[PDB]
Design a protein around this ligand. Sequence first.
Ligand code: HEM
Ligand code: HEM
Lengths: 135, 135
Amino acid sequence: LDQQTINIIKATVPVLKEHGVTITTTFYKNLFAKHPEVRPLFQPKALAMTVLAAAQNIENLPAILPAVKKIAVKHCQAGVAAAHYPIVGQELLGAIKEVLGDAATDDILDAWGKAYGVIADVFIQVEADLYAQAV
Amino acid sequence: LDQQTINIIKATVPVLKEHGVTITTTFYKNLFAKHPEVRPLFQPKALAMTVLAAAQNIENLPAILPAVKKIAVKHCQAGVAAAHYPIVGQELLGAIKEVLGDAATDDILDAWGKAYGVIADVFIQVEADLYAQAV
Ligand code: HEM
Ligand code: HEM
C-alpha cells in the first residue's frame, strides 16, 4: 500500500511482461509439482499475466472489477479457497525471481509480494461474497 | 492513502458518528442551498453516514462492494455524474468541520478529504462501468 512499493511495481512490470512466457511456464510447472493437491481443481494460461495486469493498475483496481467478477465466478464454481491464495503467490514470486536474476533485489521481491497480497484480497472478498450469495 | 491519514480516519469516525444527526442535516442544508442545480436529482438520509461507514472500512473496501453496487445502480438511474462528487465532498467536509470545532485541525480535514477522494473514486469507476454496459 506504500508509494515506494507502488513505484517499484510501476518500474518493474514492463520488465516482467517482456518475459511473460517464462513466468507463465515456470509458475505452472512449480505450482503443479509442489502442490499436487491443487491439481484436481484444474491450463488457464493467463493466470499469471492477469496478476501483472492487475498490478499495472494498482492505483485503479476498481477499473478491473468487471474482469475480476467474471474470473471470481469461475473460481467459485471450481472450489477455490482463500487458503489457495498464498500458495499461488509463493509460486508467482518464485517465477519472478528466476526471471529477474541478479536484478532481483529483496526490495523488489518484497514489493511484488505486497502487491500480490492486495490483489489477492480483492479476489478473496468478492469470492467470499459470491459463496455467501449462493444460499 | 497514507498511514497517518488512516490513523486520523480511525480515531475520528467514532466522534463523527456520535454527531451523525448534525452532520447529515448540515450537509443537506448546504448542499441544496449552494448547489440548486443538483436539486432536480432528488432525501437519502443515509448518504453521509454511508461515507463514514466506508471510511471506517477503508483498509478493506472490497468488503463493502455489495452495498456500493446497489447504490451505484441508483446513482446511474438518477444521472449522477463524476463531476458531482467534488461538490458532495466539499459539503461533507464543511459539515465535519462544524462538528469538530476546535479539534478540526488542518491535518484532520486534509485526511478526511483524502479519505473521501478514495471512496468517491470507487463509486465513479463502478458507475462509469455501468453506464458503459448500458449500451
Ligand atoms: C490473484 C490471483 C489470481 C488470478 C489473477 C487468477 C486469474 C485467473 C484467470 C485469468 C483465469 C481464467 C479465466 C477464464 O478465462 O475463464 C483463472 C482460472 C482459474 N483459476 Fe485463477 N487466478 C488467481 C488465483 C487463483 C488461485 C489462488 C487458484 C487456486 C488453485 C486459482 C485457480 C483457478 C482455476 C482452477 C481456474 C480454472 C477455472 C475454470 O475454467 O473452471 N486461481 N484464474
Ligand atoms: C461516495 C459518495 C456517495 C455515497 C456514499 C452515496 C450514498 C448514497 C446512499 C446510501 C443513497 C441511498 C440508497 C438507497 O437506500 O436506495 C444514495 C442515493 C442517492 N445519491 Fe448518493 N452517494 C454518494 C454520492 C452522491 C453524489 C456525488 C450525488 C450527486 C448529486 C448523489 C446523489 C444521490 C441521489 C440523487 C440519490 C437518490 C437515488 C434515488 O432514490 O433515485 N450521491 N446515495
